[PDB]
């Protein structure tokens, strides 16, 4: 496992409370990590380009990002790694903005220690990750429209004019709505 | 939207939600983005519009510039920033 760690400043949203130098330095020294870098805005195009270049050059097979909550940008970094050849499920997310930096402003030292611990946990999880091929399922090209008012009539006509076969279910004997 | 700090009625950060869409636009295979440009002529009709656009000279190569900002740090001339709506300053190169 060759783990590459990427700590996001997010401008001053993590950086202002957490020392994105001390946290990157620990990540470089943690077992199995072959690169540790920090960028101002990783979710942006330059940051994704940096991650892809690092994967291509250093041959990273595990990617860890110390950034905002995974519920926000996990898909973003997942499609980033793939365009650079890595499997999507080899990537890990450490939440150091919503969980550490925005809730411990009055304790910068405790915030930095918590960020270190969270990145350590993220790398520990990432060590044991394995590739998983995701299965595609077909999408039926049919639509159902519930309600026969002006909005439902408009939606049904727009879908039908775009070529899709549409069903329109209306509880009243006639359409029109209010 | 990019100039707002938060948005009503949720007081959520405007840029935090707008920036991903901007990145998506900037890296979409089906989108050709032409900034700093203006539509000059439109001729024809539906399905058959011929549009002539003029891309104004940035004096910066879009393909080469990485937006690092060193030129901004080194520039000696100050000028208003349009993004700051007349209360913020930047350099001649910005």
């Amino acid at each position: 496992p060759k783990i590459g760690v990427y700590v996001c400043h997010c401008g001053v949203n993590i950086g202002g409370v957490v020392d994105v130098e001390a946290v990157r330095d620990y990540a470089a020294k943690l077992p199995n990590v072959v690169i540790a870098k920090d960028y101002k805005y990783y979710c942006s195009d330059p940051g994704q380009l940096e991650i892809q270049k690092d994967i291509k050059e250093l041959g990273i097979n595990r990617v860890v990002v110390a950034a905002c909550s995974p519920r926000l940008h996990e898909p973003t970094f997942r499609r980033c790694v793939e365009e650079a050849g890595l499997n999507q499920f080899l990537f890990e997310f450490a939440n150091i903005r919503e969980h550490d930096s925005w809730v411990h402003m009055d304790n910068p030292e405790g915030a930095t220690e918590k960020a270190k611990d969270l990145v350590r946990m993220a790398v520990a999880k990432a060590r044991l990750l394995e590739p998983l091929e995701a299965s595609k399922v077909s999408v039926d090209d049919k639509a159902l429209v519930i309600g026969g008012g002006v909005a439902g009539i408009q939606a049904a006509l727009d879908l039908a004019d775009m070529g899709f076969k549409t069903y329109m279910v209306e509880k009243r004997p006639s359409i029109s709505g209010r | 939207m990019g100039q707002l700090d938060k948005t009503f009625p949720t007081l959520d950060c405007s840029m935090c939600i707008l920036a991903p869409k901007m990145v998506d636009v900037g890296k979409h295979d089906n989108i050709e983005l032409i900034t700093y440009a203006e539509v000059k002529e439109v001729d024809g009709y539906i399905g058959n519009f011929k549009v002539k656009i003029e891309k104004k000279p940035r004096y910066i190569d879009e393909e080469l510039c990485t937006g690092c900002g060193s030129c901004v740090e080194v520039c000696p001339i100050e000028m208003p920033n349009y993004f700051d709506e007349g209360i913020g300053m930047t350099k001649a190169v910005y």
């Binding site: 727009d158 004019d161 775009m162 070529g163 | 539906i46 399905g47």
Partner: peptide, 11 residues
Amino acid sequence: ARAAIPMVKGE
């Protein structure tokens, strides 16, 4: 959607 309808139809 409204602009796509004519382009989907193609004529």
